[PDB]
Design a protein around this ligand. Structure first.
Ligand SMILES: O=C(O)c1ccc(Nc2ncc3c(n2)-c2ccc(Cl)cc2C(c2c(F)cccc2F)=NC3)cc1
Length: 265
């Protein structure tokens, strides 16, 4: 019922630069509740033509609540900018963790996969598919649990990381690159690419050129390093099926023996 304004927030340190503004660590003045305030410059939004996309995602995002989806508490604007009031993830970016460690062990990875499969299953129930779950779009909450970030198009790919185009291609299902129709099964594919990247430290299809990466995805050709265990190979292999129809249901990922044995939750 209450209406938010810039004055309601104590703006602390800048967390990073988006394409249309900055994101800041902030506190709501009364409750001192910590949150992330994302700023967007309207004229810039309009010129990039993302103005209506932003509105659609805000409407959709506003109805989503899940422990592993970064929460949109609300938003407001003045004549020049729009302000997104976002959940703050106190443990920062997964992608950085991934380079600090190079790759994640089976317990960490399987627990992450559980968290995401729950999130994606919830999304599907809300008719929301093809959520971006590549590492650069994953944050960490106060309990080390994954948080799927919102509005990934408004931020630049990490410099230290894969660039935007490469990053996105790395995670595209064969059906979407072969220009066919797609459905929820797209999320099973992303989960499989992620699981692989978490365990190995690089996505399964990445090659020197976009062209080769494209080719490899289309043919679903990749190899497991020797250190990937049989249970992980089984799950990843079931996820990275060319025919979307042969991919597991999310409940089947959640009950998969490698997940059950390795997950903390
Ligand atoms: O460095 C630290 O010490 C650090 C860094 C980050 C956090 N936590 C955090 N929590 C929420 C958000 C962000 N960061 C965040 C920060 C900056 C920017 Cl440019 C974008 C966002 C995002 C975001 C987004 F909008 C689209 C895609 C990906 C996103 F990550 N969403 C809110 C804590 C500590």
């Amino acid at each position: 019922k209450r209406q938010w304004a810039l004055e309601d927030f104590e703006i602390g340190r800048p967390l990073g630069k988006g394409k249309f503004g900055n994101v800041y660590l902030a506190r709501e003045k009364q409750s001192k509740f910590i949150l992330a305030l994302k700023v967007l410059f309207k004229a810039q939004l309009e010129k990039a033509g993302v103005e209506h996309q932003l509105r659609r995602e805000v409407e959709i995002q506003s109805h989503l609540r899940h422990p592993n989806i970064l929460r949109l508490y609300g938003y407001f604007h003045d004549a020049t900018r729009v302000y997104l009031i976002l959940e703050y993830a106190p443990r920062g970016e997964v992608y950085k963790e991934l380079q600090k460690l190079s790759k994640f062990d089976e317990q960490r990875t399987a627990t992450y996969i559980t968290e995401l499969a729950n999130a994606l299953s919830y999304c599907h129930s809300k008719r929301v598919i093809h959520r971006d779950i590549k590492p650069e779009n994953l944050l960490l909450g106060s309990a080390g649990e994954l948080k799927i970030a919102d509005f990934g198009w408004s931020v630049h790919a990490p410099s230290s990381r894969r660039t935007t185009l490469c990053g996105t291609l790395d995670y595209l299902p064969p059906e979407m690159i072969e220009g066919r129709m797609h459905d929820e099964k797209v999320d099973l594919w992303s989960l499989g690419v992620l699981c692989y990247e978490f365990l190995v430290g690089k996505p399964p299809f990445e090659a020197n050129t976009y062209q080769e990466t494209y080719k490899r995805i289309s043919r679903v050709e990749f190899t497991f390093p020797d250190f990937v265990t049989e249970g992980a190979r089984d799950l990843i292999s079931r996820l990275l099926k060319h025919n979307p129809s042969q991919r597991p249901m999310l409940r089947e990922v959640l009950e998969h023996p490698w997940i059950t044995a390795n997950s903390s939750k």
